[PDB]
Amino acid sequence: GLSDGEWQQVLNVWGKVEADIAGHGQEVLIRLFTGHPETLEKFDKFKHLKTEAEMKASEDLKKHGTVALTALGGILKKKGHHEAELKPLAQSHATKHKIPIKYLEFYSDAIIHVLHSKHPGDFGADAQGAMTKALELFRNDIAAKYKELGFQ
């Protein structure tokens, strides 16, 4: 788990996302898709996009970015007591969307990158530590459900 101090830092950083959830959610998926084009292939409805500019221009991409980061935000605000929130995501991502856990690692990395890129000099070493631990906690708990489902 995380200490109370660490959860405080996590949710303080999340304040930055909450002020522009769609812009942050869009940049996260653009960073995913451009750094790891295999990820793009899991979305039939984005799979049409060839270029980053079409990605930037895509209002449905922004919308999905909003859906995804809102769901992460809700999970983070449970400070690890997130069993009921994780279950359906584990199930849909492992069994319907067929998303290898490695791609959730790429996604977590993309969140860190995007925070530094939008807030350079304002995402301090303590905050990156705490945010990385929360994301790892999420991945570990999801990984347990994937194992249960035989996906990984």
List, as residue ranges, the binding site. Answer: 64, 93
Closest CA to 110 of 45, 27, 46: 27
CA distances (Å), 29 to each of 9, 39, 66, 76, 102, in order? 24, 9, 10, 19, 15
How far apart (Å, rounded) are the C-alpha atoms in residues 25 and 28?
A: 5
- What's the min distance (Å) between Cβ of 104 and ligand HEM? 5
56's CB contacts (< 8 A; 6+ apart) are 26, 30
- What's the min distance (Å) between Cβ of 75 and ligand HEM? 7
The residue nearest ligand HEM at its CB is 92
Cβ proximity to ligand NO2, 5 vs 37, nearer residue? 5
Quick one: what does residue 3 bind among ligand NO2, ligand HEM, none, with the CB cut-off 5 to 8 Å set by partner type? ligand NO2
Q: What does the binding site for ligand HEM look like in residue numbers (CB under 6 A)?
A: 39, 42-43, 45, 67-68, 71-72, 89, 92-93, 97, 99, 103-104, 107
Tokens of 36: 């790891």
Torsion of CA 127, 132, 134, 137, to 10 degrees: -160
Contact 121, 18 (CB under 8 A): no
Quick one: what does residue 39 bind among ligand HEM, ligand NO2, none, with the CB cut-off 5 to 8 Å set by partner type? ligand HEM
- What's the min distance (Å) between Cβ of 108 and ligand NO2? 22
- What's the min distance (Å) between Cβ of 12 and ligand NO2? 13
Q: What does the binding site for ligand NO2 look like in residue numbers (CB under 6 A)?
A: 3-6
